Amino acid sequence: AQRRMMAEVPNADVIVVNEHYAVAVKYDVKRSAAPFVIAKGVDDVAFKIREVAREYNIAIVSAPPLARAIYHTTKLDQQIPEGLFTAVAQVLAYVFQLRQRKPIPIPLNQPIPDDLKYHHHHHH
């Protein structure tokens, strides 16, 4: 949650959002096979990421379990875990296929893996 992180949000391909979550995701294959997180924050920092993204016409999409799973499993400048690739790649496909405001609700097409979930859950 830095000015240095906030300066990177203009380079995002998408913000996955939804106590508030926002993760700014980039796909740049000359650097990494998997998308990577270039900004992330919760609550107010999440809304500052969103406001910058909207200023720069960067798609913001609501998929709450994906937003949370990315945030919990991916540090800044790190690739998302392999278990989230297909879900993020399908969000990216939708973003890239948009034609030339609340976030766009996108249904997930499969579950988020158990091992990337239950971050706040009290196990017995």
Numbering used by the authors: 252 to 269, 271 to 352, 359 to 382
From the reporting publication:
The fT3SS consists of the transmembrane proteins FlhA, FlhB, FliOPQR, and the soluble ATPase FliI together with its regulators FliJ and FliH (summarized in: Macnab, 2004). FlhB was identified and initially characterized together with FlhA and FlhE in Salmonella enterica. It was shown that FlhB consists of two regions—an N-terminal transmembrane domain (TMD) followed by a cytoplasmic domain (FlhB-C). Overall, these findings show that FlhB and FliK are important for the switching of the export specificity from rod- and hook-type substrates to filament-type substrates during flagellar morphogenesis.
First, we wished to determine the crystal structure of the cytoplasmic domain of FlhB of the main polar flagellar system [FlhB1 (Sputcn32_2563), henceforth simply FlhB], which localizes at the C-terminus of the protein (SpFlhB-C; amino acid residues: 222–376). The crystal structure of FlhB-C was determined by molecular replacement employing the structure of Salmonella typhimurium FlhB-C as search model, and refined to a resolution of 2.1 Å. Values in parentheses are for highest-resolution shell.As observed for all other FlhB-Cs analyzed so far, autocleavage was also seen in our structure. This autocleavage occurred at the highly conserved 269NPEH272 motif and leads to two tightly associated subdomains FlhB-CN and FlhB-CC (residues 252–269 and 270–376, respectively). Second, our structure of SpFlhB-C resolves a PRR involving residues 356–376 at the very C-terminus of FlhB-C, which was not observed in previous structures. The PRR interacts with an extended canyon-like surface area formed by helix α4 of FlhB-C. At its C-terminus, the PRR is also in close proximity to helix α3. The interface area between the core domain of FlhB-C and the PRR is 855 Å2 of buried surface area. Our analysis identifies the following hydrogen-bonding pairs between the PRR and helix 4 of the core domain: K360-Y353, G358-Q349, G358-Q352, R359-Q349, R357-Q352, Q368-Q342, and Q368-A339.
